[PDB]
């Protein structure tokens, strides 16, 4: 798909949740850091 006319991206505005974003061109993102991790079982 394309951005809404006159826009370069979409902001998905979220009580505790932060925003999600959508770009329609892959050149508008660079993968700076690769993070290797495990999720931790709570205490």
């Amino acid at each position: 798909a394309h951005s809404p006319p006159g826009h370069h991206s979409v902001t998905g505005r979220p009580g505790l949740a932060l925003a999600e974003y959508v770009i329609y061109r892959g050149e508008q993102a660079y993968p700076e850091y690769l993070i290797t991790y495990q999720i931790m079982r709570p205490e």
Binding site: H8, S9, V10, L16, E27, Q28, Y30, Y37, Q38
Partner: protein
């Protein structure tokens, strides 16, 4: 390919600021951890800098275009991306194949401020069938990977949701 991965030392300020973004942006999810697992924090195993000359110049070229359409404002963010295709992304970059066709906000490439949001997509949409080894969306053993990405938003369409 052109891509090299540079290991950051845990002692490096860059390692510590990326870890802090990863740890501080965990939240509880409305699925009670169905997609991404049950956790309040991560065991960070490694942070690598992704270095690809071509892909960087591809990024900075598009950033200048957006910037010049937006009173010299790229509106650049650092955001999380989870995908089974992280290996293809670091080598070939983001493209049509990395789009979320069924996405709430349209068929494009999705990024999250919440690391725990991107974590839901590492094994696919809704966490798919979980880790390839144990078939467990809440696996505490298997090594997961997230991208921390420089994203040009430019003029962003504000969509209110739920």
């Amino acid at each position: 390919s052109g891509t090299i991965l540079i290991d950051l030392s845990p002692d490096d300020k860059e390692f510590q600021s990326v870890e802090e973004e990863m740890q501080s942006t965990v939240r509880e999810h409305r699925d009670g951890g169905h997609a991404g697992g049950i956790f309040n924090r991560y065991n960070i195993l490694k942070i690598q800098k992704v270095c690809n000359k071509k892909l960087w110049e591809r990024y900075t070229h598009r950033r200048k275009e957006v910037s010049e359409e937006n009173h010299n404002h790229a509106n650049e963010r650092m955001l999380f991306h989870g995908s089974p295709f992280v290996n293809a992304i670091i080598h070939k970059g983001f493209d049509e194949r990395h789009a979320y066709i069924g996405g709430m906000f349209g068929a494009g490439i999705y990024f999250a401020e919440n690391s725990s949001k991107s974590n839901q997509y590492v094994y696919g949409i809704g966490g798919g069938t979980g880790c390839p080894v144990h078939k467990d969306r809440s696996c505490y053993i298997c090594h997961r990977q997230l991208l921390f990405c420089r994203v040009t938003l430019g003029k962003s369409f504000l969509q209110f949701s739920a």
